[PDB]
Amino acid sequence: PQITLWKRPLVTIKIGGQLKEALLDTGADDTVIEEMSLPGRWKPKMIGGIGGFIKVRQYDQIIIEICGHKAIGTVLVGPTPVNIIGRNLLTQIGCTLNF
Amino acid sequence: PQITLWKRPLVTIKIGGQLKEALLDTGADDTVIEEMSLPGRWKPKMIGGIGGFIKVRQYDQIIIEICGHKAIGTVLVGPTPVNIIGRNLLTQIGCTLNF
Ligand SMILES: [Cl-]
Ligand SMILES: [Cl-]
Numbered sequence: 001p002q003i004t005l006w007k008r009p010l011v012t013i014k015i016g017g018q019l020k021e022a023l024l025d026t027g028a029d030d031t032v033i034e035e036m037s038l039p040g041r042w043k044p045k046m047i048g049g050i051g052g053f054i055k056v057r058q059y060d061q062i063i064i065e066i067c068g069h070k071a072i073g074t075v076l077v078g079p080t081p082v083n084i085i086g087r088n089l090l091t092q093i094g095c096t097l098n099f
Numbered sequence: 100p101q102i103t104l105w106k107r108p109l110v111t112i113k114i115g116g117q118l119k120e121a122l123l124d125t126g127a128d129d130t131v132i133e134e135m136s137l138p139g140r141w142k143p144k145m146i147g148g149i150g151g152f153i154k155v156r157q158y159d160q161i162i163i164e165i166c167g168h169k170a171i172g173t174v175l176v177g178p179t180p181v182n183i184i185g186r187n188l189l190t191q192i193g194c195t196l197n198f
Pocket of ligand 2: 099100
């Protein structure tokens with residue numbers, strides 16, 4: 001699709017069999033998703049502030065569907081106030097900025 | 100242009116006769132630029148944290164050139180660690196996300 005920027009680029013994603021709303025965020029390196037159940041192994045990471053503040057679970061090789069386009073990548077799962085789709089997944093779906 | 104997302108979308112902007120590096124950030128509603136001189140009237144605003152923490156100067160009707168495209172809009176000027184081009188200016192240059 002082509003997504004205009006007059007409103008926040010919030011889209012429906014499908015991840016772990018669940019539908020969620022997420023922000024397509026070219027300013028974010030990484031993808032962070034609210035607490036949820038995901039299968040497979042994960043490793044603990046520390047994010048936010050100076051050198052980590054909040055504990056999240058890093059899941060690799062997670063498939064996320066974004067407007068009918070599947071992306072595969074690393075997702076950090078924890079108590080984030082907003083689900084963020086960052087560049088690590090935007091590149092996977094071939095997303096570009098255009099003007 | 101078409102800007103890919105393999106690297107942070109940092110671009111050169113021209114604002115107030117000066118060249119700066121700025122992040123094209125679809126996750127940001129507004130545009131914030133590091134301390135600099137700009138002509139005309141401004142009004143004080145409070146941004147960051149809960150209900151404002153850092154004082155900035157709001158300048159309206161500022162022209163910013165982004166990759167050969169002029170945008171006109173409101174710019175908040177203050178001690179930000181990164182220059183951010185937010186949706187208020189991205190829409191002005193006709194920037195869209197595409198996949
Ligand atoms: Cl499509
Ligand atoms: Cl062009």
